[PDB]
Amino acid sequence: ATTFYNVFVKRNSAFVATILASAFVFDMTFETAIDNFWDRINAGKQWKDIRHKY
Amino acid sequence: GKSTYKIPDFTPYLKKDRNTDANRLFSYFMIGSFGMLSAAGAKATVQDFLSNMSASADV
Amino acid sequence: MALRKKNSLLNMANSYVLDSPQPSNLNYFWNFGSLLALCLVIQLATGITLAMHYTSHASLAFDSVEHIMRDVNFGWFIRYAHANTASFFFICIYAHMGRNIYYGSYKTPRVLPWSIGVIIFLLLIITAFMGYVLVFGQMSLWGATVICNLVSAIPWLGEDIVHFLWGGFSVGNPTLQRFFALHYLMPFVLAVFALLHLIALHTAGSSNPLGITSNVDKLSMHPYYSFKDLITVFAFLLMFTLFVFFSPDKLGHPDNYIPANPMVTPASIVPEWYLLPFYAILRAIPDKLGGVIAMVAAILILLILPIVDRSIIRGNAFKPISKLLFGFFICNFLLLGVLGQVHIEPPFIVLGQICTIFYFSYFLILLPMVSTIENIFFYIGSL
Amino acid sequence: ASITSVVKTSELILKSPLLSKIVVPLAKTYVKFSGYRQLGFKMNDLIIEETPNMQLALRRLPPTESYDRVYRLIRATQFSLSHKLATGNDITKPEEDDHYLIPYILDVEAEAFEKDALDNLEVV
Amino acid sequence: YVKKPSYKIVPHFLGFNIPTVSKWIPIFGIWGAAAGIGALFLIEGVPRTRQDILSKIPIIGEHWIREIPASDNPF
Amino acid sequence: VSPKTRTSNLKNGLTIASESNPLVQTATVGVWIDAGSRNENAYNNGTAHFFEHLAFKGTDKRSQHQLELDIENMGGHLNAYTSRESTVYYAKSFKDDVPKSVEILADILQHSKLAESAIDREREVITRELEEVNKQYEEVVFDHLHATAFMNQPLGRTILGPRENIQTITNTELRKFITENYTADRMVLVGAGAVDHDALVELAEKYFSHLPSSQSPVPLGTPIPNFVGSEVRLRDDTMPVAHIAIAVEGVSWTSEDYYTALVAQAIIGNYDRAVGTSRHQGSRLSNIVSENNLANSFQSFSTSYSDTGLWGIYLTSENTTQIDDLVHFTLKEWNRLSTSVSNLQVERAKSQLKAGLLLSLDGTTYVAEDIGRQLTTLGRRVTPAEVEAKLEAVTEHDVRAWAQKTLYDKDIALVGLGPIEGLYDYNRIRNDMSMMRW
Ligand code: HEM
Ligand code: HEM
Ligand SMILES: CCCCCCCCCCCCO[C@@H]1O[C@H](CO)[C@@H](O[C@H]2O[C@H](CO)[C@@H](O)[C@H](O)[C@H]2O)[C@H](O)[C@H]1O
Ligand SMILES: CCCCCCCCCCCCO[C@@H]1O[C@H](CO)[C@@H](O[C@H]2O[C@H](CO)[C@@H](O)[C@H](O)[C@H]2O)[C@H](O)[C@H]1O
Ligand SMILES: CCCCCCCCCCC1=C(C)C(=O)C(OC)=C(OC)C1=O
Known part of the structure; x- marks a missing residue:
């Protein structure tokens, strides 16, 4: 907790760097997660689901 | 009521672990998460919005 | 207490235009600031009016400008007023900047109004560039093409940025419609920065031609400078009248009366006269990216005048050598302007390079040397 | 550039016979x-004053010198706005062009520059 | 007996000296990283960024290698 | 090189510590006790200070008047003070009047009457003291500062105690307090000036030999305080000067960071517009404050207790529209202890302190106070050679590391008194404890 604070939080330069890197990771992972979820709730309905017929 | 050295009761609000790094770190985790979603939200907003200026489908 | 002082809104106006304490000895070169405000007001009134009759779509743009000239009541006036005032705006802005450089207006404590001023000048260039494209004649199109292609020189992302700016793969309808929207906006941004540089100035007040403090002897802005500003307003309106009514096309290019044709390239693609010195500086550097950097640097180098001027005295009124160097710098800037519109031919190629070196060496070598030596001459000379 | 710089360089030149x-x-x-x-x-009337150091030097002028400087600034401002030159006794004669301000600013700057040096001292 | 205090003046410029600046060198480093991460993140959507930078990162880089099937592409 | 501090014990556990100076003709003998207000609970808070009054109110032998006369006849004076962790009773006299003074001190400590009539008389005197400290603004500020920093803890209590207790303190509870606390293993007999150690040890064996020993003798200076970031505002628009103290939790006497905290304190230092030299001081904060007229004075402090401390600054200012600037610039100078300090500031502060810790001891009372303080807090007198070594060991890395765990982004205790409208709310003050640029 001290260690974590000292490395990532104490210096604002490090805090902002950590926040931005997390935002990058979140953005990429959230994209992928929503894509999969959206495809499961709308299964068999989307073009990608019928495309194989044509 | 009269003496100003008798501090009012703050026991309903005081945390026991108020001076610990864990205590501070928690609040910075909240601030940091909020900054993280604001950064990710701003990035998405800017990217999607400015893309209007790239060649439209008809071009 | 007087209402003009008591009421906070009135008091802001009062502090700028009525009770504002001014030096008692401003000469006629202090009148370009109000002429620039006049140009800005004319451009807003005429520009908003043209926008009521102009169509930004590339199929209709050029014809909407002909409709303005031919069918709209006083459309010819509004159009020529707008077109000529764009040139007058640059004459006034060069005069205003020249005044500022000669009288040391960039020195402490006026670094901030000067630095904001440099940005106002860049905004004016962008505003005027975009407005010129809107006609969609041959110079409009080909000028947009070559100027926007300079962005391709930005390494790695340059080509991508150009396609992004154009909204396509060449200058066309998407580019014209975006330039209309930005051309409408940019003058409002410019007016905000014009206001910011004045507010920044108000902490020191105006400088004056002697370069000394005026805190000893102040005059109200009104009525003294109000009525002095009227003289130059009427002088300006006479010049405006001679162009707009008697010679409305003298400052323009005939090719801009030919509709844009992506196939046919005009004989010579030159910028509007007021951009010509910067174009000469760009041509001087053989490298594409080099040339763009030089062209931008030629404007941004104004930001270092507060540093490179080493003088203990503000302004050139009493500095004979600085006055001679200023004379050469100004004439060189006009030569660069002329060389911006000659053909890329001998011997103008080398001359353009020499003039470009002189332009930069003023800031980097000559002014620091001359200002140092004059410091020593004032001290030894008056012992 | 600082008055200190100007004065030092000038003294180097005045030393060298050739120079x-x-x-x-x-x-x-x-x-x-x-x-x-x-x-x-006078020459010293022209020195830029809108600086902390120069404001301090001007405050240290003797009252008489201070009042006379104010008059020269006002009188010059009147000649400027009228587009006239001084005539007769209003012209500064070379013998009247005295460096009344140089000693005050050189003291102000001496302290300011010593303060900067001593802010960077390293105990050995 | 000590006759004089023992000190020197360190070189300085605009109120900066080397001892002080050296303490901030690492901070400039992290701010540079923050600016780098931020910049790259802002242009992550730009196709050239993906093609030239992001897709080349080992393991992770396949996130940015995505093809539209020719059957689904009007252009 | 100062003469050696000699130290002996008696059988009961009373320490005798002496430092002779054959250049002076006076001597300060006294008793330093490792006990004070902090040893009270909430019900008898004020007892220790109450006793200090009664100590001079008559003993089993000498009455109040006889006591007065005995001291008058000695020629010197007696003095006493009670703090939170320490009680002192000393007697300044002539060289050869030392046996009288030891005897009087032994009498007032061991054999005091504490007569109900005198309890009742002082009960009014002390009640009047409650309404006259009000004038001593520095003390008002520091008492509120302890109250809030150590909210509802023993260190947070005042020395005087509440009005309610003053009305209910009995001779029984007074006797109980001094019987529990004034024990031989908690006491040090100190002599400085023209005292012989061997003579003083004999006088201790004569007068303080029948002192109670405590059941569980802990070492001298043996104590958990939980600092509360908090603020007290005592706005008074009618006062012309604002008094402000800001403190973080500091270091105890025996902390490993004790010297590091003193060096840090010396980097900020003190300032007083009334002193001629203060406009020229090397401290950055001093320069900012003097150039801008932000304050009449500031005083950095690093107060230690047995198990905690407060480290901070006390400011006074008439500039009531720039209190914000004053506080802003002060906390930005603290920020620099974490971000910017180098060998330049650290070595300068060490130089200043190496002398300062020795300079302070310039009279017999100061020497006795130093022996007494060190013996009751550390269990030994630390020699100047050891102190010089501990200071020399403090590096720039030590100061930065200390400030980063103690100051940087930490909660403060803040007290404002007087025209403090311009003192911003807690958050804006506490936000100055870090720099966003770092
Ligand atoms: C739309 C453009 C502008 C407007 C309307 C404008 C207007 C004004 C006005 C009214 C003043 C006060 C009166 C005067 O000295 O003339 C002024 C002063 C000034 N302007 Fe501008 N200005 C403009 C552009 C610029 C530019 C481009 C610069 C610098 C590159 C600049 C730098 C200054 C400076 C330094 C002053 C103070 C000069 C002094 O009094 O000593 N301005 N401006
Ligand atoms: C600083 C202010 C301005 C400058 C320097 C400026 C400059 C220009 C220029 C150089 C042109 C080319 C003129 C031609 O040759 O026909 C133009 C056209 C135009 N401007 Fe502006 N302009 C300004 C403000 C505005 C504003 C506020 C509007 C509001 C919409 C506007 C609307 C137009 C329109 C619609 C055209 C095209 C019609 C035409 O060519 O006349 N302008 N402008
Ligand atoms: C200072 C800021 C830096 C410059 C800002 C950069 C401006 C433009 C950046 C990218 C804009 C286009 O970037 C592109 O964005 C769109 C979303 O917006 C993404 O497109 C993705 O989502 C959209 C809808 O959200 C879907 O229709 C699409 O099928 C999917 O691929 C692309 O994957 C990305 O390549
Ligand atoms: C030039 C266009 C005309 C419109 C005026 C521009 C609008 C924006 C102006 C407001 C910006 C704030 O501008 C600021 O206002 C206050 C009061 O108004 C001025 O304050 C000044 O005047 C008032 C009385 O007149 C005095 O109390 C004060 O001592 C003096 O400094 C500032 O000198 C000016 O910098
Ligand atoms: C929209 C922002 C435009 C800013 C300019 C509007 C003000 C009109 C010019 C008036 C003026 C000002 C303020 C001024 O300060 C000044 O004194 C140096 C002048 O005359 C010599 C002026 O003419």
Whole structure:
């Protein structure tokens, strides 16, 4: 907790760097997660689901 | 009521672990998460919005 | 207490235009600031009016400008007023900047109004560039093409940025419609920065031609400078009248009366006269990216005048050598302007390079040397 | 540039016989052509004052010197706005062009520059 | 007996000296990283960024290698 | 090189510590006790200070008047003070009047009457003291500062105690307090000036030999305080000067960071517009404050207790529209202890302190106070050679590391008194404890 604070939080330069890197990771992972979820709730309905017929 | 050295009761609000790094770190985790979603939200907003200026489908 | 002082809104106006304490000895070169405000007001009134009759779509743009000239009541006036005032705006802005450089207006404590001023000048260039494209004649199109292609020189992302700016793969309808929207906006941004540089100035007040403090002897802005500003307003309106009514096309290019044709390239693609010195500086550097950097640097180098001027005295009124160097710098800037519109031919190629070196060496070598030596001459000379 | 710098460099030149022989006549002509004396100024009246150091030096002027400087500034401002030159006794004669301010600013700057040096001292 | 205090003046410029600046060198480093991460993140959507930078990162880089099937592409 | 501090014990556990100075003709003998207000609970808070009054109110032998006369006849004076962790009773006299003074001190400590009539008389005197400290603004500020920093803890209590207790303190509870606390293993007999150690040890064996020993003798200076970031505002628009104290939790006497905290404190230092030299001081904060007229004075402090401390600054200012600037610039100078300090500031502060810790001891009372303080807090007198070594060991890395765990982004205790309208709310003050640029 001290260690974590000292490395990532104490210096604002490090805090902002950590926040931005997390935002990058979140953005990429959230994209992928929503894509999969959206495809499961709308299964068999989307073009990608019928495309194989044509 | 009269003496100003008798501090009012703050026991309903005081945390026991108020001076610990864990205590501070928690609040910075909240601030940091909020900054993280604001950064990710701003990035998405800017990217999607400015893309209007790239060649439209008809071009 | 007087209402003009008591009421906070009135008091802001009062502090700028009525009770504002001014030096008692401003000469006629202090009148370009109000002429620039006049140009800005004319451009807003005429520009908003043209926008009521102009169509930004590339199929209709050029014809909407002909409709303005031919069918709209006083459309010819509004159009020529707008077109000529764009040139007058640059004459006034060069005069205003020249005044500022000669009288040391960039020195402490006026670094901030000067630095904001440099940005106002860049905004004016962008505003005027975009407005010129809107006609969609041959110079409009080909000028947009070559100027926007300079962005391709930005390494790695340059080509991508150009396609992004154009909204396509060449200058066309998407580019014209975006330039209309930005051309409408940019003058409002410019007016905000014009206001910011004045507010920044108000902490020191105006400088004056002697370069000394005026805190000893102040005059109200009104009525003294109000009525002095009227003289130059009427002088300006006479010049405006001679162009707009008697010679409305003298400052323009005939090719801009030919509709844009992506196939046919005009004989010579030159910028509007007021951009010509910067174009000469760009041509001087053989490298594409080099040339763009030089062209931008030629404007941004104004930001270092507060540093490179080493003088203990503000302004050139009493500095004979600085006055001679200023004379050469100004004439060189006009030569660069002329060389911006000659053909890329001998011997103008080398001359353009020499003039470009002189332009930069003023800031980097000559002014620091001359200002140092004059410091020593004032001290030894008056012992 | 600081008055200190200007004064030091000038003293290097005035020391060198060769240098003074060639610089002093130039400097005197420069000053004559400069023409500030024709508005009744002294050289020191022209030094930029909107600086902390110069505001401090001006506050340290003796009252008499201070009142006379104010008058020269006002009188020069009147000649400027009228587009006239001084005549007669209003012209600054070379013997009246005294460096009344230089000693005060050199003291102000001496302290300011010593303070900067001592802010960077390293115990050995 | 000590006759004089023992000190020197360190070189300085605009109120900066080397001892002080050296303490901030690492901070400039992290701010540079923050600016780098931020910049790259802002242009992550730009196709050239993906093609030239992001897709080349080992393991992770396949996130940015995405093809539209020719059957689904009007252009 | 100062003469050696000699130290002996008696059988009961009373320490005798002496430092002779054959250049002076006076001597300060006294008793330093490792006990004070902090040893009270909430019900008898004020007892220790109450006793200090009664100590001079008559003993089993000498009455109040006889006591007065005995001291008058000695020629010197007696003095006493009670703090939170320490009680002192000393007697300044002539060289050869030392046996009288030891005897009087032994009498007032061991054999005091505490007569109900005198309890009742002082009960009014002390009640009047409650309404006259009000004038001593520095003390008002520091008492509120302890109250809030150590909210509802023993260190947070005042020395005087509440009005309610003053009305209910009995001779029984007074006797109980001094019987529990004034024990031989908690006491040090100190002599400085023209005292012989061997003479003083004999006088201790004569007068303080029948002192109670405590059941569980802990070492001298043996104590958990939980600092509360908090603020007290005592706005008074009618006062012309604002008094402000800001403190973080500091270091105890025996902390490993004790010297590091003193060096840090010396980097900020003190300032007083009334002193001629203060406009020229090397401290950055001093320069900012003097150039801008932000304050009449500031005083950095690093107060230690047995198990905690407060480290901070006390400011006074008439510039009531720039209190914000004053506080802003002060906390930005603290920030620099974490971000910017180098060998330049650290070595300068060490130089200043190496002398300062020795300079302070310039009279017999100061020497005795130093022996007494060190013996009751550390269990030994630390020699100047050891102190010089501990200071020399403090590096720039030590100061930065200390400030980063103690100051940087930490909660403060803040007290404002007087025209403090311009003192911003807690958050804006506490936000100055870090720099966003770092
Ligand atoms: C739309 C453009 C502008 C407008 C309307 C404008 C207007 C004004 C006005 C009214 C003043 C006060 C009166 C005067 O000295 O003339 C002024 C002063 C000034 N302007 Fe501008 N200005 C403009 C552009 C610029 C530019 C481009 C610069 C610098 C590159 C600049 C730098 C200054 C400076 C330094 C002053 C103070 C000069 C002094 O009094 O000593 N301005 N401006
Ligand atoms: C600083 C202010 C301005 C400058 C320097 C400026 C400059 C220009 C220029 C150089 C042109 C080319 C003129 C031609 O040759 O026909 C133009 C056209 C135009 N401007 Fe502006 N302009 C300004 C403000 C505005 C504003 C506020 C509007 C509001 C919409 C506007 C609307 C137009 C329109 C619609 C055209 C095209 C019609 C035409 O060519 O006349 N302008 N402008
Ligand atoms: C200072 C800021 C830096 C410059 C800002 C950069 C401006 C433009 C950046 C990218 C804009 C286009 O970037 C592109 O964005 C769109 C979303 O917006 C993404 O497109 C993705 O989502 C959209 C809808 O959200 C879907 O229709 C699409 O099928 C999917 O691929 C692309 O994957 C990305 O390549
Ligand atoms: C030039 C266009 C005309 C419109 C005026 C521009 C609008 C924006 C102006 C407001 C910006 C704030 O501008 C600021 O206002 C206050 C009061 O108004 C001025 O304050 C000044 O005047 C008032 C009385 O007149 C005095 O109390 C004060 O001592 C003096 O400094 C500032 O000198 C000016 O910098
Ligand atoms: C929209 C922002 C435009 C800013 C300019 C509007 C003000 C009109 C010019 C008036 C003026 C000002 C303020 C001024 O300060 C000044 O004194 C140096 C002048 O005359 C010599 C002026 O003419």
